[PDB]
Amino acid sequence: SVEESEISAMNQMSWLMKTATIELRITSLNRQRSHTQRLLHLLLDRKILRILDSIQFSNEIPEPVIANCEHKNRRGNVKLLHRVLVAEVNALQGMAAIGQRPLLMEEINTILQYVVERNKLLQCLHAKRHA
């Protein structure tokens, strides 16, 4: 990982990690010679961890009514929160027509698009930590 960590990819990596430990324990209980040379040679070639560190740093960098939207994200809702937000925006515009209807519509498209994009961004971080 160098630029992105997908949800499914963090889950896949975790499963692989889980698979490695059981095998290690089995090797530990009883001993096999080809197996010991493979493990010892493998431990002689940290690099993977270093590589993952950069990905983690990138993820941190990415992580780096607005209040209502923030609360909805913490609670998480695109299908539930997103629609709610859209309706609320409509109701907030309800009182005032605004100077330009087309411009307002464009802003609405721009705000709801960006909103969900950002929420999906936030959603990843949970997968990257889990991985």
């Binding site: 907030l92 009182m95 605004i98 100077g99």
Partner: protein
């Protein structure tokens, strides 16, 4: 018969009684109107100082504890609580000092000072709650705070920090007990008692100097039990652990010797705090101060108590009670909102303030509320509406918050009514906006093509009822210009004529025809330009 109506201010409600207009030759006899409201609980000029001081203290309490918590866990919290109690004691002292204020002839102060003292007792209890030796020391401090009479005076002060020779010896014996090892004091008292037995007003004084320790009880009987307890903490053993005996002495000594206050004190000794709260309710004051004390107790509720968790719930109730108590003093309302920190009480008292409505000051308060908010939008809109009802500045503020259409209609009407009319909005950088742009274009034309173009675009977007005058102005602009590129306008002009015809169908005529003829000329000019 009773008819009751709530007014829009909590301290102003009305009760009236309906009777028959005439009955048995007799007209109505109940025309009295009763002004039902808040009444007794909040009153007085100096009262204001005390209430204000209390509010300030509450604000300080809110300010400090939260900040400390932000700091996070420390002993500091243990000491911080003690400091707040000290501040409360200082406030009580200030209140006692104020009573001084009342002047002849005749005065009220004992109730004011006596009422204050109860608050002081609570502070002492809190300090005690804040080991047995330390408690004894606290009791001694409380006692300090609190012929034979001369001898008592000599002793009382000491306790709070041949016959004559015998008295001096007795005093020395008494000293040899406080110094010591409690086991050494036990033996020291016995020897003094033996000396007294050997001895079998000056003699009485000598016996008192021997002490050890019988007389103090007699003095209490002559009196007070609390004083006797203080004396015990001071000169016998300065550990305060068991209050059954002391309690009996106060209870029996007091009986041998306001009653409600004594009962409240007994409840406090029991440790309450529910009983103490009930006593406060019975007193009925201070209400807000009592609520603040409850909140402080909730904050303190350190020691792993399920009751305290219930205690926390009780504290939460108290803040709500304080909010209910608040009525119309704007700073007090702000303090209440701070204590609450929800939006319930918020918009609620917000609109209570709306009732209240000085208009500029109210607007400033609304702005402050908005700043605090950093629901809210609805409240802001309501405030804007209220200000508009109360003029041009308010309308502009409402437009900024967004009525705007109505403003556009007004401004457009004003710009039609007077040619020399000046509009602030127009000078400054929807349909109303388009109309304003058209007006600006007209102004540019008056100044003496970009302006005229903007005016026509404003017309194509929207239309105006005088509208005919605007069309005439456009024609004049074309004449100034010579209408080379209008081409569309002649086509545009025909559409306008059709619209006028439609309006006529829905609903100076000669003059109106002339304008159409003038328009035709511009179209002809455009045709000539096209030919060229």
């Amino acid at each position: 018969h009773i008819g009751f109506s709530w007014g829009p201010g909590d301290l102003l409600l009305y009760e009236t009684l309906y009777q028959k207009q005439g009955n048995s030759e007799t007209a109505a006899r109940c025309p009295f109107m009763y002004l039902v409201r808040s009444d007794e609980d909040i009153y007085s000029p100096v009262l204001r100082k005390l209430f204000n001081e209390s509010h300030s203290i509450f604000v300080g309490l809110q300010k400090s504890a939260e900040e400390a918590s932000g700091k996070s866990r420390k002993a500091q919290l243990v000491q911080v609580s003690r400091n707040y109690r000290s501040v409360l004691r200082a406030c009580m002292e200030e209140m006692h000092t104020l009573s001084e204020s009342t002047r002849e002839t005749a005065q009220k102060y004992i109730s004011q000072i006596s009422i204050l003292s109860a608050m002081e007792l609570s502070w002492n209890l809190c300090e005690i709650l804040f080991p047995a030796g330390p408690l004894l020391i606290l009791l001694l401090e409380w006692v300090r705070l609190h012929h034979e009479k001369f001898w008592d005076g000599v002793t009382g002060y000491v306790l709070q920090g041949v016959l004559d020779d015998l008295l001096k010896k007795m005093p020395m014996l008494h000293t040899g007990g406080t110094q010591t090892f409690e086991l050494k004091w036990q033996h020291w008292r016995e020897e003094c008692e033996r000396h007294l037995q050997n001895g079998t007003h000056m003699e009485a004084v000598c016996r008192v100097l021997l002490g050890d320790e019988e007389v103090l009880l007699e003095k209490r009987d002559l009196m007070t039990w609390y004083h006797f307890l203080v004396s015990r903490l001071l000169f016998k053993h300065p550990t305060v652990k068991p209050t059954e005996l002391h309690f009996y002495a106060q209870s029996s000594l007091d009986m041998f010797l306001p009653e409600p206050l004594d009962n409240i004190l007994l409840a406090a000794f029991e440790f309450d705090i529910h009983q103490v709260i009930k006593e406060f309710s019975i007193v009925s004051s201070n209400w807000w101060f009592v609520a603040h004390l409850t909140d402080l107790l909730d904050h303190c509720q350190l020691f792993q108590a399920h009751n305290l968790y219930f205690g926390a719930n009780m504290r939460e109730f108290l803040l709500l009670d304080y909010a209910s108590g608040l009525f119309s003093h704007h700073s007090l309302w702000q303090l209440g909102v701070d204590y609450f920190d929800p939006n319930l009480g918020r918009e609620y008292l917000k609109l209570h303030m709306e009732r209240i409505p000085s208009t500029e000051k109210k607007a400033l308060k609304a702005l402050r509320i908005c700043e605090q908010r950093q629901q809210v939008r609805s409240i802001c809109k309501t405030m804007a509406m209220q200000s508009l009802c109360n003029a041009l500045s308010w309308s502009i503020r409402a437009k900024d918050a967004a009525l705007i259409s109505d403003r556009f209609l007004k401004e457009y009407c004003e710009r039609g009514n007077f040619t020399d009319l000046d509009l602030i909005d127009n000078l400054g950088s929807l349909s109303d906006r388009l109309t304003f742009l058209g007006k600006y274009r007209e102004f540019h034309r008056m100044y003496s093509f970009s302006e005229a173009a903007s005016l026509l675009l404003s017309l194509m977007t929207a239309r105006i009822a005088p509208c005919s005058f605007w069309l005439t102005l456009l024609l004049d602009a074309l004449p100034l210009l010579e209408q080379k590129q209008v081409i569309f306008s002649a086509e545009q002009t025909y559409e306008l004529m059709r619209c006028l015809e439609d309006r006529m169908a829905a609903k100076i005529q000669k003059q109106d025809s002339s304008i159409d003829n003038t328009k035709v000329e511009m179209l002809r000019l455009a045709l000539a330009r096209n030919l060229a």
